[PDB]
């Protein structure tokens with residue numbers, strides 16, 4: 001863990017915008 | 019249009035100088051120190067000095083003044099940018115900013131200064147490029163600088179493609195002594211530590227209010243940043259055309275975007291201070307802090323600095339939660355809290371004596387500021403949509419990012 | 434001290450020459466008038482080491498105005514270095530040529546400036562533009578005689594966009610002056 | 611003290627020696643140096659400064675410092691005379707007008723107390739045209755036989771051909787090296 005907010009996985013783009 | 023840029027010391031001795039144009043004699047640096055002393059003593063001291071017809075702009079560094087003498091009316095903003103770039107390059111190459119490293123890496127320092135700018139025109143500004151061409155422990159110049167893509171060095175190979183993002187939030191609240199907050203601005207910071215193989219072209223996507231309105235999805239929580247500044251690698255053409263954040267990420271940690279917009283929400287911490295100071299008899303510190311943030315968020319390492327009297331002594335603290343320590347150097351009491359859960363209410367009651375002899379002159383009323391930092395909290399509600407990582411070879415990236423909320427200019431005017 | 438430094442500089446040991454150069458730079462950086470040793474360092478100038486060449490060029494630039502008469506023994510070295518295959522060496526030589534405030538020194542460097550005007554390296558092109566701008570600032574009549582205005586104008590209409598920007602800045606400075 | 615390391619170094623060759631390049635401008639100094647070091651006649655511009663090079667022959671690295679014959683470079687030979695073990699003079703047998711100037715310069719240079727341990731090394735340059743003198747007429751005109759306490763040898767070398775360089779190098783090695 002790490003203070004200041006744990007790292008989270010990020011997507012590649014908005015899948016709902018086509 | 020600075021004639022020459024030099025690095026000085028606190029005693030007036032120049033740590034290092036590098037002439038670029040030669041239109042100003044090197045002996046003018048000696049008169050800079052007396053001029054600075056006179057200006058400080060007379061209140062006329064300014065970063066842009068002027069020795070007759072030659073201006074010696076100086077910037078206060080960690081240990082020395084970065085004096086950049088100039089002769090004509092050159093670009094002052096350009097000179098400041100060059101000085102900032104030089105400071106950043108020195109910080110990257112040298113981990114310490116003091117006289118110890120100035121006299122320890124002079125052999126490489128001279129080469130770096132020569133390569134940085136010539137004839138008053140800066141030429142090299144990439145710290146990685148400078149390290150790939152100038153080292154303290156030479157080959158031909160890299161082709162990345164000659165090529166257009168100077169923010170992503172080609173040929174980088176990594177075992178894994180991991181990017182460490184950081185959603186840094188700065189909450190600045192200017193609360194007047196009357197209880198009304200005047201300056202309430204929140205500045206975002208999208209800094210990513212990209213460490214992958216090659217030079218992937220980042221395709222940034224977030225829940226922006228402008229982007230949602232353009233795409234017709236302007237109905238959810240979209241962050242409308244008043245000021246958004248792209249990084250060096252960010253392509254401004256795509257952003258101007260359709261807000262397309264397409265750019266080559268740098269090799270390492272860099273700030274791609276930095277949101278900056280006003281805040282119209284209630285403060286995360288509501289602090290009520292009481293000054294029950296007797297007339298040279300005793301002092302009362304009725305400090306009450308209310309956490310206006312969500313209860314699910316905890317403020318780690320909360321340090322609410324309450325300025326105590328300059329001549330106050332023998333203080334007694336009557337608080338409920340959080341350690342209170344009076345720092346003689348700081349001349350104030352800091353309400354240190356390890357973890358501050360949202361909605362927490364801390365009450366403090368200070369009591370200390372005062373000297374019998376009255377003070378000769380007043381000391382002013384510095385504002386009270388807190389050092390709260392609660393991560394994993396997105397007050398602005400801006401959610402990143404996706405990060406378009408595109409590679410010609412083709413690889414599966416696993417980027418990571420963390421949202422950190424801290425207290426910036428959260429200063430409350432004293433009563 | 435001075436005699437020992439001169440003896441070390443007059444030796445055939447590369448490590449000793451490097452140590453003497455470092456000591457001279459430290460004395461020069463510390464505030465020691467090392468201009469009297471410039472003629473001694475003139476002989477120990479043509480060196481294969483890139484670090485030594487940079488230090489020698491810096492000393493010559495800092496000892497050029499002090500000893501303009503003694504600076505006449507560096508034209509051959511500059512001419513030889515102007516054809517160095519390494520782009521960094523060529524850029525350093527171009528920077529040193531324009532940094533020498535010698536009235537009779539820039540006259541012999543006109544041919545190297547013309548040769549380096551068409552440098553293919555964008556860094557080389559930027560260095561050539563900077564040297565041309567420095568020569569024009571030092572001698573506007575010399576720059577006009579050399580006819581670098583035509584080359585400078587066509588520089589913006591070339592590749593190496595950073596080199597194009599450097600040439601544009603040089604042309605603006607020439608027109609500004 | 612022990613000299614075992616010195617003997618081991620000298621068993622396979624340790625002596626290097628030194629050499630200097632003197633003569634009038636356009637007298638084959640640069641071309642002669644290029645032929646000695648590389649082996650080809652490479653065109654060179656005027657010797658504004660100086661040319662420094664090292665030649666390894668017979669296990670001896672004889673460094674050569676080319677010196678121009680220009681008016682502004684003629685008085686600069688005094689600086690190059692320091693830390694120099696050998697000296698080579700380049701004459702122009704086809705330049706009758708410049709012959710007197712070269713002789714005067716050689717007499718002035720040889721009249722220096724510092725330049726006393728260096729043996730005479732005169733090369734008959736421009737030995738490709740009929741106007742070039744022989745190895746005795748040039749020496750007689752320059753008065754090489756009047757140099758008391760000077761070991762000078764007359765050698766004629768053609769810049770285009772390069773003949774005589776090996777003989778001159780062998781003579782210089784014999785004069786300098788007094789070993790087997």
Ligand SMILES: Nc1nc2c(ncn2[C@@H]2O[C@H](COP(=O)(O)OP(=O)(O)OP(=O)(O)O)[C@@H](O)[C@H]2O)c(=O)[nH]1
Pocket residue numbers: 634635636637638639640641642652653654655656657677678679735736737738768769770771
């Ligand atoms: N082609 C040719 N040139 C010769 C010959 N002998 C002497 N030279 C001269 O040697 C010169 C070579 O020029 P450089 O390489 O610069 O050497 P240098 O004679 O010392 O001239 P500087 O460097 O200017 O002092 C030519 O200009 C010729 O005039 C010869 O036999 N053939």
Ligand SMILES: [Mg+2]
Pocket residue numbers: 636638639640641654656657676
């Ligand atoms: Mg020559």
